[model samples]
Target chain A: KPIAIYPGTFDPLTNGHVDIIERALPLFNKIIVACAPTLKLEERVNLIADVLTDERVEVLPLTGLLVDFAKTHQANFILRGLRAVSDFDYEFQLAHMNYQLSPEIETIFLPAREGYSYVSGTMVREIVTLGGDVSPFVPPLVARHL
Target chain B: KPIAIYPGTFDPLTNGHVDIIERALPLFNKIIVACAPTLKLEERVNLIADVLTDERVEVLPLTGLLVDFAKTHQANFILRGLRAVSDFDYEFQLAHMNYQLSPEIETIFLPAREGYSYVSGTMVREIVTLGGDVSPFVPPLVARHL
Candidate 1:
């Protein structure tokens, strides 16, 4: 069976975040949403809670290696969402290494939704902390968390 | 420092194979030769023993997972040899998957030497079993084993 794993630190899942998962569903037999714990900033909590309202997603809070995390989940395809040029160097290097490791699993990339292309966890936090409107940046629940 | 891992099942190393290592040496601070033990065959054991004599080559008999191997070695790059079009599909998928696992390791492919492009383990075995001249197909030490 063809399986794909989508990994991220969905600190507070946004609509833009959901767009990625929904778009990827038709392409793979099983889509796993692996929530990384390492990317979290100090004092951050409830990360999985923020995104777990939807049962379709599996929330894996991992502290070890990402490759092992994906393998444990039996994922043959990996998905990454790119929002800009700055992400290329890092993502490109990673794709190459993963190929070296298994040479059987493939990584595919998808561009972020146009309007939310610039949206990020940092930007959302900053805007909400400054009392600016964050309705456009995240889902209702995530907006409430901020 | 940029480091790369060259992983393969070098049952019998050839001078042509050594040429690639020499060519790639100056490009990175370190090159690790990680051998895949799972793919070994009894017929190739003697051939592999003779090829592993070089001090510059570090032979790691690896099994289970490759991503973990690269991480353990601190390798940021992975090197692969391309001899034919049939290898692309398999290589391509592996490259993509590895990227998903770490997004830090990159894979690079180098073509086999033109004169030795058609040479392979299967071909060498066939020639030796048929009592045909295999001197041109393999390294001198390997030919002796046949």
Candidate 2:
């Protein structure tokens, strides 16, 4: 059975982020939700809480290089969500770098839903801090934290 | 002066469509907004109006073959917009077929603006028919028509 890892900060999992996770679940035998230690405190808490409810999702905290993290976690493939042109520039570079580091691991991108493509963690935080409704931007569980 | 031709039915232009035009304009000396011949009467008037407003945009009715149309227009480049994975399959086949027909003619695709990637002409039409606000989906002139 092939395993895939979805690595992200998730910072209170936006609707866009949740959409990617739900859509990617059926593609792999097991999905590992890996959170990097560099992510902010709130992001780590939200990511852990979201993955806790899902039996198939294994939550792990990793430090150092991502390629090493993938190898340690036994991830055959890496899953990522691409939102915009700016994201492609960075994601493509990272994918190429990761391929160079560990050619055995493959990276696959799932595009975010159109309306949610512009949504970002920073924007979500800003909207919520300003007392705006973040229901449309974030998943129900994550929205509750806001 | 290198000229590129962007051919489409453009029954109504979306923001994604406009983004491609704006992006391609700077890459070539001249860009032609060529329109395919109308299969229905409703599209004829709308297509003509869309092409007539801009001096830089040369709109011609395409007939017979697309490669032949590109050759007649003196366009060595064919510009296309790709929105999703489903579009890539059809677009890849078309690009390969066109290359086989004319090796000199190249088809280059610009990924649609993420925010409007899922906004298609059909979707816009359906939303307009249902009295949903299409202003955000379409260009201002096209939105007025709807």
TM-score of each: 0.46, 0.47
Off by over 4 Å in 2: A38-43, A46-48, B1-146
What DockQ values do the models have?
0.02, 0.02
Off by over 4 Å in 1: A38-55, B1-146
Q: After superposition, how far is residue B111 of candidate 1 from its true place, in Å?
A: 17
lDDT of 2 by residue, B29-125 (tens): 7777766644253464355456346556666655546677778888899899999987875576567546655688999999987697888978877
Measured on C-alpha atoms, candidate 2 has an lDDT of 0.74
Report the TM-score of chain B alone for all candidates.
0.78, 0.85
Residue B79, candidate 2: Cα error in Å is: 30
TM, chain A, every candidate: 0.80, 0.86
Query: Candidate 1: what's its TM-score on chain B?
Result: 0.78
Q: Which candidate has the highest TM-score of all?
A: 2
Specify the highest-DockQ model's number. Answer: 1
